[PDB]
Design a protein around this ligand. Structure first.
Ligand SMILES: CCCCCCCC/C=C\CCCCCCCC(=O)O[C@@H](COC(=O)CCCCCCCCCCCCCCC)COP(=O)([O-])OCC[N+](C)(C)C
Ligand SMILES: CCCCCCCC/C=C\CCCCCCCC(=O)O[C@@H](COC(=O)CCCCCCCCCCCCCCC)COP(=O)([O-])OCC[N+](C)(C)C
Ligand SMILES: O=c1ccn([C@@H]2O[C@H](COP(=O)(O)OP(=O)(O)O)[C@@H](O)[C@H]2O)c(=O)[nH]1
Ligand SMILES: O=c1ccn([C@@H]2O[C@H](COP(=O)(O)OP(=O)(O)O)[C@@H](O)[C@H]2O)c(=O)[nH]1
Ligand SMILES: CC(=O)N[C@@H]1[C@@H](O)[C@H](O)[C@@H](CO)O[C@H]1O
Ligand SMILES: CC(=O)N[C@@H]1[C@@H](O)[C@H](O)[C@@H](CO)O[C@H]1O
Ligand SMILES: [Mg+2]
Ligand SMILES: [Mg+2]
Ligand SMILES: [Mg+2]
Ligand SMILES: [Mg+2]
Lengths: 597, 597
C-alpha cells in the first residue's frame, strides 16, 4: 500500500515511523534538499544512499545494526517547489514506487544499481519519505519542516542532511553514525569530494579543478582542526548530522525565529542573522546552558559532489558562502561570553574560548583579504620592476591598469549589472587574473633564484605532508594549483561580488528594503575604507602627500615604504601560522583516531 | 453646453476648433503637462495664462489680435494618469466648469484673479481643453497625443508647451507669439524665473537660491547665444513654442518612433535616443531637407517656475537633465553632416556647422567636469598646503579623505541605494562640499592677496555686465554664488548620480534590460577611465611609478607636476572663453533687438 499526506499548517503547528505497531526508532534521518536538480543529480544521492543501507544490513557483529538494519533508517526527500521541479526525476521516483506541503511515504523493495551517462537501471528495502512543497521558499523553510515537524513525530536519535546531487560513499553514512556512540558528541559530518568526471575529464574545466583543490584541502585541514577543539564552524549542508536531543529547544528556536528579544525597530543581529544559515545551530548547540556538547568530523565517510563548471553560476554560488561565513563568525564571536555560561568542564570551556577566538581571527583575515591581495600583487610587481626593471615596469603599470580596470569593472558590474549577462567579460577577467598569477609566480621564482622562498616551501610542504597524511594527495598534481590560477579570482572577483551584494535586494517590505539597502551600502563603504586605511598606511590617499608637506614645513615622495615589507612578511608569517595550526589539528586528529582504533 | 470625448486609439489613428461653422485657427496651442501637481501648482499656470489672454483681447492696433483675440487661442490641459491625480485640482477645474484618453472642452467665462496661500477666487472667455489620460505613460506619450493628434485636427500655426506649476508672465505668451511673424523662424521659448517666495523667503532654502542663479544666468546667457546662431539646444519644456509646419513630417516621426532604419539587434543611437527628449525636435527641424528654419529665444516673455527645495528630489530631477543633454548633444553632433544637406543658405549652413561644433565642445567639457573639479580642488588645496603649510596640509588630507569618502559613498549609494532613503547623509555631503567650496575660495583669496585673479575677476565682471545688460542683476546679490556653495554638489553629486544611473533600470523586456545594463555599466567605466586618464596624465595610476622606474633604469617621485598648472590655466582660459562667447552672444542679441525695435 502507498499512502500520501498533504500538510496545510506550518511545521510548528504540525510520520509513518510513529504510525506503527512497534514505535520505530529514527536512529538516523537523511534530509534530501532538491530545488530543480537534474534527474541524474537527485538520482546520484539516492543511488549513493542505497549502497549505504546495503552495507548496514549485511553486517553481522553489531548490537544496533544487522539483517534488520533497514527498519531504523528513514530517508526524507524534501523537494522545494513543484512548479520548478523537473518531471524527469519525478518519473525516476515513480519507477521506484515513490511518486502547504505534500508527503509521500513508500517502501521500495527495488534498488537502482546502474547509472550510465543517461540511463538508470532498476532491479528487484528502503523507507522513503518524499516531501513535496507547494510554493518555493528558502531552504531554511525546508529545514523548518525537517526539525519543527517530522523530528518530533519520529523522535530521531540523529538527523542527517543531504543535497540532491551528492554521492554518499560506498560506506559513508554508517561511518557517520559511528561517531555518536560517544555520548558527548552533538554533531558530525562527512568529507566532500568533487566529481572530476569519468577518467578525471571535468579536471579540464579549470574551475572544476579549482573547486577540487578547494574542497579536498578544506576537508583535509579545516574540518579536522575545528573538530579537535569541539566546535566545527559549518556542518556542510551537503552531508552533515546533528543529534536531535542536542539541537532540541533553544538552538532550533534561535535558528528559526531569529533573536527573540526585539523591538519594532531593527538592530544589527536580530535583523541580519539570515546571512549565516545552518551556522547558528553549531553555536547554539555547543554553548548550550548546562550541557557539554561536542562537534566532530568523520573522516571515514565521504561524499562526492557536483560542481558548477562555468564562471557566472560559480560566482552566484560562492556569494552565499562568503556572506554566510562573515555574518556567522561575527555573531558567534560577539557572543563568545556565553561559552562560559554553559555546562562544559573548565578545560572544555577554555578550549572553546580559544577556538572561537581562532575563528574570529580567521574571519578578520578574510575581511582584509582584498587589500592583502592588492598589496601582495602590487608590491610583488613593483619589486621585480624595481630590480629586474626591463619589461616588468611597463608590465607593472599594464597589470596595475589591468587590475584597476578589472576591479573597477567588478564593482560596477556587481553593483549595477548581473553576472549571467556579462559572461565573456568575466571569462576575460578570470584569464587576466590568471595571467597575473602566472606573472606573480614568475616574479617569485625569478627573484628567489637570483637572490619568502623559505615560507613558500614550508607552506607547500605542510600542505603535502598533511595531504598525504590524509591519504588523498593525488589532487596536489590533479592540476590543483596549476588550475588554482582561479585563486586570484577567488580573492577579488568573489569577495567584491559578495560584499557588494550583501543582502540580495529586490526593490513593512519597503522599510525593510530601505534599511537593508542602507546596511548593505554601509558595510560596503566600511569594507572599502578599512581596506584602504590598510592600503594607505602603501601610503596612498594623500598620506604620502601629508608626510611630504610636513617635511617641507621645516622635498619629494619615495616609491617604496618598509610598511609594505612589514605587511609583506607579516602576511606570509600569518598564513604560515594558519597552515601550521591546521596541520597540527589534522595530525592530532589522525593520531587520536589511529590510537583509538 | 459642456461636451466630453473618450479617445480609444493611439494619436496616429486619432478637436472642437475644427468642429465649428467657421474653421477656427489655432494661432497658438498651449500644452499643460500635469502628472500629480498640487492644486496651487497647476492653478498657477492657468492663472498666469488667463492674464495673457486678457492682454491679447484688450489690444487695439493689431491685424491678428483684438476684441476677438480670445477665439484664436486653445489651451489644452494634458493630464498624465487619473489615478495619481489630486482631486483638489480637479475640484478647482470643476469650479471653472471644465471638469485610451478623456477629452474635456469647455468655454470658461469666469476668471481666477486671486490666489492666496491656500484660497483661489473665481469671479464673473477661455477655450479650455482638458485632456485626461487613462494610465500613466511617459511625457513623450503626452507629446505624441499633442502632435500626432490634436495638431492635425486643429492645424496650429504655433504650438506652445507649458508645465502645470509654471507662471506665464503678465504679458509673456503674446511676446512669444510675436516671434513667428518672421517667416524663417521655427521655434521660440520664454525665459524661466524661479519662485523665490513672498518677500524672497524661499531664497532661504540654499537650494532654491542655487537653482535661482542657475536659471537666471542660463536664460541670460545660453538661450541668447544659441538663438543668435539659429539652433537652440533645448526649447525648455516649461515654456516653449514650435511652428507646426516646421516640425511637421520628418522631425515628428524621428522624435516619436525612433530612428526608423533598424534591425532586430540594438545599435547605439536607434536604441539610446530616449535619453534626449524634446531635444531631437530642434535638430530634425533646423537641419531639415530643403528648408531654412531658425530657432529664436524671446526675452520679453517670462515664466516663473516652482523648484524642489530638498536635496533628494533635486538630485532625482537633475539626473534626467544631465542624461538628456549628453545623449542629445552626442547624437546631434555625430549627425552634423546633414546640416549641409538642408535648404539653408551658405551663410546659414556655415553658422549652423559652427554652432553644432560649439555645442559638442560644451558637452565635451561637461563630460570631463568630474575630473576637472577633482583636479581644481586637489591642486588648489595642495597649492596652499605647499605654500601656506600650517593647518592646510592636515586640512588637505582631511578634505581629500572627506572628498574620497563622500565620492566613493556617492558611487556606492547611486549604484546600490536610493536618494530618498539616505537623506541626512546627502545633506551632510552637500554641507561637506559647501565647506570645501568655502575652503577653496579662502585659498583663492589668501594666495591671491599674498602674491587666476585676473581670470576670476574677468569672468565675474562678464557675468555682471551681461546680467545688468539683461536688466536682471539683483539675483547676483540674492545670495546667488553665496548660495552657489551647492555648485560643488552640482559638479560631483549630480554627475555621479547621473551617469551611474544612465538608463534607470527596473529588473523582449529581459534582453532589453540586459543590453541597457551593459551599456550603462560600460558608459560608467568609460566615464571613470577617461576622466582618470586625464587625472593620471596628476600622474596617478602608476604613471609616476613608471617614470620613476625608467629613471632608475639608467630616484624618487615629485609631488607636483606642471601638467596640473597647464591643466589648471587651460581650464580657466577655457571657461573664460565660454563666458566670453556667451556674453558676446547676449550682447549681439540685445543690440539686434534694440536696433530692430
Ligand atoms: C588604478 C588605475 C585604474 C583606473 C580605473 C578607475 C579609476 C578609479 C579611481 C581611483 C584610482 C586611483 C589610482 C591609484 O593611485 O592607484 C594607486 C593606489 O592603488 C589603489 O588605490 C588600488 C585601487 C584599485 C583601483 C581602484 C578602482 C576600484 C574602485 C574601488 C576599489 C577599492 C580599493 C580597495 C583595495 C585597494 C596605485 O598604488 P601606488 O602607485 O603604488 O601608490 C603608492 C603611493 N606612493 C607612490 C606615494 C608611494
Ligand atoms: C582618496 C581616499 C578615499 C578612500 C575611500 C575609498 C578608497 C578608493 C580606492 C582608490 C583610492 C585611491 C587613493 C589615491 O591615491 O588618491 C590619489 C589620486 O586621486 C584620485 O585618484 C581621486 C579618486 C577619488 C577617490 C576614489 C573613490 C571613488 C572611486 C571612483 C572614483 C572615480 C575617479 C574619477 C575622478 C578622479 C590622490 O591624488 P594625489 O595624492 O595628489 O596623487 C599624486 C600622485 N603623485 C603623488 C605620485 C604625484
Ligand atoms: O535557493 C536555494 C538554495 C539551495 N537549495 C537547495 O540546496 C541545494 C544546494 O544547491 P546547489 O548545490 O545547486 O548550489 P548551492 O545552493 O549549494 O550553492 C539545492 O540542490 C536545493 O536542494 C534550494 O532549494 N534553494
Ligand atoms: O515622469 C514625468 C516627468 C514629467 N511629467 C510632466 O512634466 C512636468 C515636469 O515635472 P516636474 O516639474 O515636477 O519635474 P521635472 O520632471 O521637470 O524634473 C510634470 O509636472 C508633469 O506634467 C510627467 O508627467 N511625468
Ligand atoms: C564557510 C564555508 O565555506 N562553508 C561551506 C558551506 O557553506 C557549504 O555548504 C559546504 C559544502 O556545500 O562547504 C562549506 O565549506
Ligand atoms: C540642457 C538643459 O539643462 N535643459 C533644461 C531642460 O531639460 C529643462 O526642461 C528646462 C526647464 O525645465 O531648462 C533647460 O535648461
Ligand atoms: Mg542542486
Ligand atoms: Mg549542488
Ligand atoms: Mg510638476
Ligand atoms: Mg515642476
Amino acid at each position: 500500500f502507498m499512502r500520501y499526506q498533504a500538510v496545510t499548517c506550518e511545521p510548528n503547528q504540525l510520520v509513518r515511523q510513529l504510525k506503527y505497531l512497534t514505535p520505530r526508532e529514527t536512529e538516523l534521518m537523511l534530509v534530501v534538499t532538491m530545488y530543480n536538480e537534474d534527474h541524474i543529480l537527485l538520482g546520484r544521492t539516492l543511488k549513493g544512499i542505497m549502497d549505504n543501507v546495503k552495507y548496514m544490513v549485511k553486517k553481522k557483529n553489531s548490537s544496533t545494526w544487522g539483517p534488520d538494519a533497514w527498519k531504523k533508517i528513514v530517508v526524507c526527500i524534501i523537494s522545494d517547489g513543484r512548479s520548478k521541479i523537473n518531471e524527469r526525476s519525478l518519473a525516476l521516483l515513480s519507477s521506484l514506487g515513490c511518486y502547504a506541503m505534500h508527503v509521500y511515504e513508500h517502501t521500495t523493495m527495488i534498488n537502482i544499481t546502474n547509472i550510465s551517462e543517461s540511463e538508470v537501471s532498476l532491479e528487484c528495502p528502503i523507507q522513503l519519505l518524499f516531501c513535496l512543497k507547494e510554493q518555493n521558499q528558502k531552504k531554511i523553510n525546508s529545514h523548518r519542516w525537517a526539525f519543527e515537524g517530522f523530528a518530533e513525530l519520529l523522535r530521531p536519535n540523529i538527523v542527517t542532511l543531504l543535497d540532491a546531487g551528492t554521492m554518499p560513499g560506498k560506506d559513508s553514512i554508517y561511518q557517520l553514525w559511528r561517531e555518536f556512540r560517544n555520548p558527548n558528541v552533538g554533531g558530525a559530518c562527512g568529507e566532500i569530494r568533487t566529481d572530476l568526471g569519468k577518467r578525471f575529464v571535468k579536471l579540464l574545466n579549470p574551475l572544476v579543478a579549482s573547486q577540487n583543490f578547494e574542497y579536498k584541502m578544506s576537508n583535509i585541514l579545516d574540518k579536522t582542526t575545528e573538530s579537535n577543539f569541539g566546535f566545527i564552524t559549518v556542518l556542510p549542508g551537503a552531508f552533515s548530522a546533528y543529534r536531535f536531543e542536542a539541537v532540541r529547544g533553544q538552538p532550533l528556536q534561535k535558528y528559526f525565529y531569529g533573536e527573540i528579544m526585539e523591538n519594532e525597530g531593527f538592530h544589527f543581529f536580530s535583523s541580519n542573522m539570515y546571512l549565516a544559515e545552518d551556522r547558528i545551530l553549531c553555536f547554539e548547540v555547543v554553548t548550550k546552558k548546562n550541557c557539554n556538547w561536542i562537534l566532530k568530523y568523520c573522516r571515514s565517510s565521504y561524499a562526492s559532489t557536483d560542481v558548477p563548471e562555468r564562471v557566472p553560476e560559480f560566482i552566484l554560488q560562492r556569494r552565499r558562502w562568503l556572506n554566510g561565513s562573515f555574518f556567522a563568525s561575527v555573531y558567534s564571536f560577539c557572543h563568545f561570553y556565553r561559552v562560559w555560561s554553559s555546562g562544559h568542564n573548565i578545560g572544555r570551556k577554555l578550549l572553546l574560548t580559544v577556538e572561537f577566538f581562532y575563528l574570529f581571527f580567521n574571519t578578520l583575515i578574510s575581511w582584509f583579504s582584498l587589500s592583502s591581495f592588492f598589496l601582495v600583487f602590487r608590491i610583488l610587481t613593483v619589486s621585480i620592476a624595481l630590480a629586474y626593471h626591463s619589461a616588468f615596469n611597463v608590465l607593472s603599470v599594464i597589470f596595475l591598469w589591468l587590475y584597476g580596470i578589472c576591479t573597477l569593472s567588478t564593482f560596477i558590474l556587481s553593483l549595477g549589472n548581473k553576472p549571467k549577462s556579462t559572461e565573456k567579460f568575466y571569462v576575460l577577467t578570470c584569464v587576466i587574473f590568471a595571467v597575473m598569477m602566472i606573472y606573480m609566480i614568475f616574479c617569485s621564482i625569478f627573484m628567489s633564484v637570483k637572490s619568502i622562498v623559505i615560507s613558500l616551501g614550508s607552506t607547500y610542504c605542510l600542505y603535502l605532508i598533511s595531504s598525504i597524511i590524509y591519504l588523498q594527495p593525488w589532487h596536489m598534481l590533479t592540476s590543483f594549483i596549476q588550475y588554482i590560477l582561479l585563486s586570484p579570482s577567488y580573492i577579488n572577483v568573489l569577495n567584491i561580488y559578495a560584499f557588494c551584494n550583501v543582502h540580495d535586494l529586490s526593490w513593512y517590505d519597503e522599510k525593510k528594503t530601505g534599511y537593508y539597502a542602507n546596511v548593505r551600502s554601509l558595510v560596503i563603504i566600511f569594507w572599502v575604507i578599512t581596506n584602504f586605511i590598510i592600503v594607505a598606511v602603501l601610503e596612498t590617499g594623500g598620506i604620502a602627500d601629508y608626510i611630504a608637506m610636513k617635511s617641507i614645513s621645516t622635498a619629494e615622495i619615495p616609491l617604496m615604504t618598509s610598511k609594505a615589507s612589514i605587511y609583506f612578511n607579516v602576511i606570509l608569517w600569518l598564513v604560515a601560522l594558519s597552515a601550521l595550526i591546521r596541520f597540527i589539528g589534522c595530525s592530532i586528529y589522525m593520531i587520536v583516531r589511529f590510537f583509538k582504533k
